[PDB]
Amino acid sequence: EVQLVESGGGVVQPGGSLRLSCVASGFSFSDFGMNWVRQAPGKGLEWVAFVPFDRRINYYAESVRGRFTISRDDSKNTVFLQMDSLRPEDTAIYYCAKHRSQWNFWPREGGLDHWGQGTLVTVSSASTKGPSVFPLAPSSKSTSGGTAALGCLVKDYFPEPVTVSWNSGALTSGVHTFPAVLQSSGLYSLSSVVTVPSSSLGTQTYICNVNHKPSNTKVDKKVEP
Amino acid sequence: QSALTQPASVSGSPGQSITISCTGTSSDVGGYNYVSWYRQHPGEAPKAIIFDVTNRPSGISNRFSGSKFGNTASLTISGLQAEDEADYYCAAYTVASTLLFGGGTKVTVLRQPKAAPSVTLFPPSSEELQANKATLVCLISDFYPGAVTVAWKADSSPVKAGVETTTPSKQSNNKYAASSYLSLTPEQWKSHRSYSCQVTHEGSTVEKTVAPT
């Protein structure tokens, strides 16, 4: 069967360069046009570039033209993607994909019949950093049915993950630690909330215990009205 | 360079038929018959399921069929089965000799009642404001199918700057959670009368509002 193997992914500083390779097997490589398609974390597929059979014109998405260059070495069954002047928004899994139709000069007939598993390119200057933690106080806006929602906002950490407990693990019911958002800076943030009886707010103490093992940072913060 | 337009979410019960639309322009979908479709399961690479509008690769179930009329191509999946739950992408050759993908559609095979999101919106904390920052926190939970769109308003006008939104994540109860964050300066926060987080799920919007203290 057709096999496509991408490599070269890793972490690069914004403005930097990286060269990706795709090694193909299981078909006559020199007979087919080849593509790169990328996918940012949790987002959609974006076609990037196409290299035709037999040394014609290469085609590119406007988003990468002038910064990325596609090429091939038929003797090595390899497609390359040279990436210069990288930006945070170039962060993605980069897929190699074969064009279905034989000898096409454009990414046209047949679509993309086979794909590799991809290689991750991360463009970021982020480095190990513990979170800044802020209380999300209960109030009338977060209270319904005699139940109050309160939380902790866990900002600006790297890398993933953080863990959040409440009252040192003694409070587990009604706890929800949401998935993290990735900021443009390369840092993450998330929130954890717990729902509690609104009648207990003046008598019971609520503390979020934030643990960020990757930076060896722990934060305990009391949250109150 | 805008993506071809697909619905965010299409769902059906097992055994039903569903259709996913893919609307381009006469520059692409309406310009050529080189429209292809791809299925992608979470954690996996895309797989070709339809090419040149109507053709199935070998190995692809004949429950999948493709068509096209005017600027809109359609993928139909009949006899919906559990394994069909996945993301689906269309793509079309363009007049610029490029290939252009649609935005993708999450197909859900319904196995529990649809459930609108619970939305809780928190204002910046007094602590954060003193750090010279301000974050509005819109937490969205227990929704199904797992797709929502989020919009923010300052007073009554949309704001797009400073918004970051997670992709929905499956919870232990098989419903979904997501979050959206609006970053402001403390003076922006204090100047306006209120800010709102609007969450749209399956065509219906739930809204929450907060105001400076």
Residue numbers in the entry:
A (entry chain H): 1 to 52, 52A, 53 to 82, 82A, 82B, 82C, 83 to 100, 100A, ...
B (entry chain L): 1 to 9, 11 to 27, 27A, 27B, 27C, 28 to 95, 95A, 96 to 106, ...
Could you pull the original sentences from the published paper?
Multiple VHs and VLs were obtained, but only one VH, named 19.3H-HC, neutralized the founder Env when combined with either of two highly related VLs. The two R880F mAbs produced by combination of 19.3H-HC and 19.3H-L1 or 19.3H-L3 are hereafter referenced solely by their VL designations. To interrogate the antigen-binding site characteristics of R880F mAbs that influenced their distinct neutralization profiles, crystal structures of the 19.3H-L1 and 19.3H-L3 Fabs were determined to the resolutions of 1.7 Å and 2.7 Å, respectively. ODA analyses indicated that the antigen-binding sites of 19.3H-L1 and 19.3H-L3 were very flat, forming roughly rectangular shapes approximately 15 Å wide and 30 Å long on top of the six CDR loops.
Five total amino acid differences between the 19.3H-L1 and 19.3H-L3 VLs congregated in and around CDR1: 19.3H-L3 contained two threonines (T) and one phenylalanine (F) in CDR1 that were not present in 19.3H-L1, while arginine (R) and glutamic acid (E) residues arose just downstream of CDR1 in the FWR2 region of 19.3H-L1 that were not present in 19.3H-L3. A change at any one of these positions resulted in resistance to 19.3H-L1 neutralization. 19.3H-L1 neutralized 2-B12 more potently than the founder Envs; this was directly attributed to D341N, as this single substitution introduced into Env 0-B24 (0-B24 D341N) increased the founder Env's sensitivity to that of 2-B12. 19.3H-L1 modestly competed with itself but could not effectively compete for binding with 19.3H-L3. Three CDR1 residues that differed between 19.3H-L1 and 19.3H-L3 (Ser/Thr at residue 27, Gly/Thr at residue 29, and Tyr/Phe at residue 32; Kabat numbering scheme) did not create any substantial structural differences between the two antigen-binding sites. These changes did, however, have the potential to influence antigen-antibody interactions. The resulting mutant, 2-B12 S335Q, was two logs less sensitive to neutralization by mAb 19.3H-L1 than the parental Env 2-B12, but did not reach the high level of resistance achieved by 2-B12 S335N; in contrast, S335Q had only a slight effect on neutralization by mAb 19.3H-L3. In combination, the structural, neutralization, and ELISA binding data indicate that mAbs 19.3H-L1 and 19.3H-L3 likely recognize overlapping epitopes that are centered on I295 and E338; however, 19.3H-L1 is more dependent on D341N and the N333 glycan motif for neutralization than 19.3H-L3.
